[PDB]
């Protein structure tokens, strides 16, 4: 499935910035961050108390653009080798191809990166992949096809990547548009905007 609708309405109803509708052409992002949604979302919560972990789960889903049933799969693979479901979950989400293409800077958002992947413009190990959920391996090479390399869409995103946060776990060259993903993302340089104490009893009602 996919949303297909007004994009800033997502960042508003999640109370979280998704890099949607902002960029080098807007002032102070002009995305009304921390202004409350609608006329009932402007009022105090009634705390079920299940509602606060549902707020925090939707937030981490919406950042990485992930569906509920697919997040119930990440919550199952995160628990492996006793890796902590509040830590390895973020290393798997941050290791998605549609997030790695956004971190390498070939798109301005994870949604632009997902559309470059699904439209067959992205390659890994020199081979084409259309799967946005693809889990990127250590010491593997990501590249872009020449018909997309011809477009301003991808070069404007690399010019935006020089004014943005550079991650430590991957390298990229903007002249060839080719990046090496080096090692697993770790807690020391990965920064998460959620309480790890709200993701401890998920799917157990």
């Amino acid at each position: 499935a996919r949303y297909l609708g007004p994009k800033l309405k997502l960042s508003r109803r999640e109370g979280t910035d998704l890099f949607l509708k902002s960029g080098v052409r807007a002032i102070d992002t002009k995305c009304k961050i921390e202004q409350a949604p609608g006329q009932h979302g402007a009022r105090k919560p009634r705390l079920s108390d299940y509602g606060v972990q549902l707020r925090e789960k939707q937030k981490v889903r919406r950042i990485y653009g992930v569906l509920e049933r697919q997040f119930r799969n990440y919550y199952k693979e995160a628990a492996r080798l006793k890796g902590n479901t509040g830590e390895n979950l973020l290393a798997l989400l941050e290791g998605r191809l549609d997030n790695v293409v956004y971190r390498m800077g070939f798109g301005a958002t994870r949604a632009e990166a997902r559309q470059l992947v699904s439209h067959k413009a992205i390659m890994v190990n020199g081979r084409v992949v259309n799967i946005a959920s693809y889990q990127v391996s250590p010491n593997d090479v990501v590249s872009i096809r020449e018909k997309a390399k011809k477009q301003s869409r991808v070069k404007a995103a690399l010019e935006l990547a020089e004014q943005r946060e550079k991650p430590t776990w991957l390298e990229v060259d903007a002249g060839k548009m080719e990046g090496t993903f080096k090692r697993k993302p770790e807690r020391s340089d990965l920064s998460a905007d959620i309480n790890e104490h709200l993701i401890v009893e998920l799917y157990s009602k």
Partner: protein
């Protein structure tokens, strides 16, 4: 450190001829999120005072849980009135699982790797006294290595 938790609330259904009474009874637990737990029950006017009247007791009966490598040594059974319980060590995140009236007791002790279930003629405010009876029955390294003789 400190952990305080609310499990359930009850209202006394009486109509005091003026209307339905504002008398409430709360079920609570208190711990540290590292290895301590105590059990709270109390009755007062409105929920914001009944929660304090219940945690009054949880602070007065708090004990340390005998853990071995961050979980229990053995499977153990607990009893109080009509309620029975069975509690056993498990693995990381495979204890919870367990429903709200066990989840609260385990999360104030900071554990997610212990499984618990209630059995028999259960009553919402008595199952916690059986859960704690299984932790009073739980073996500690206090006498086992000092008793074989000699």
């Amino acid at each position: 450190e400190l952990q305080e938790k609310l499990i359930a609330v009850n209202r006394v259904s009486k109509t005091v001829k003026g209307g339905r009474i504002f008398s409430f009874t709360a079920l609570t637990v208190v711990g540290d999120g590292n290895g301590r737990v105590g059990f709270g029950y109390g009755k007062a006017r409105e929920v914001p005072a009944a929660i304090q009247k219940a945690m009054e007791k949880a602070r007065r009966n708090m004990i340390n849980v005998a853990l071995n490598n961050g979980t229990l040594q053995h499977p153990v059974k607990g009893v109080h009135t009509g309620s029975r319980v069975f509690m056993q060590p498990a693995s990381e995140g495979t204890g919870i699982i367990a429903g709200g009236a066990m989840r609260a007791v385990l999360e104030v002790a900071g554990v997610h790797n212990v499984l618990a279930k209630a059995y028999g003629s259960t009553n919402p405010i008595n199952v916690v006294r059986a859960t704690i009876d299984g932790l009073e029955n739980m073996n500690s390294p206090e006498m086992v290595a000092a008793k074989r003789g000699k």
